[PDB]
Structure 1
Amino acid sequence: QLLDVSRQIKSYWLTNSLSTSFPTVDYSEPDLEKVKRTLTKLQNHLLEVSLIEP
């Protein structure tokens, strides 16, 4: 029974919320520009773009 209550108290110590979001994998930031090339060019595919013009 003491093992029971002990496990209980374990749960009570551990049922507390995590202080924040916690680290995992944020490694290697994605390219901003290959994304833009996919977006634009694959959407610009087969188009007669005249650059930007004034």
Structure 2
Amino acid sequence: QLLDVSRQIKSYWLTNSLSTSFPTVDYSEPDLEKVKRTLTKLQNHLLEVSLIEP
């Protein structure tokens, strides 16, 4: 019965909320530039772009 109590208490100490969201692999933070050049190029694929102008 004593161990039965101990498991209860252990369960109570793990039912509490996390202080924070957990860390992960934030490593190799992604570039924005290549994404732009790729999207803009593919969208302009086989297209004769002629600048912008106002």
Do Structure 1 and Structure 2 share a fold, with TM-score over 0.5? yes
Q: Which runs of 5+ in 2 are unaligned?
A: none
SS in structure 2 at match of 1:18? coil
| Separation in 1, partners of 2:22, 2:45 | 42
| Separation in 1, partners of 2:30, 2:52 | 27
TM-score, normalisation: structure 1: 0.85
Aligned length: 54
TM-score, normalisation: structure 2: 0.85
Q: CA RMSD in A?
A: 1.1
Question: Deviation at 1:22?
Answer: 1.5
Question: Deviation at 1:25?
Answer: 1.2
SS in structure 2 at match of 1:22? coil
Question: Deviation at 1:37?
Answer: 1.3
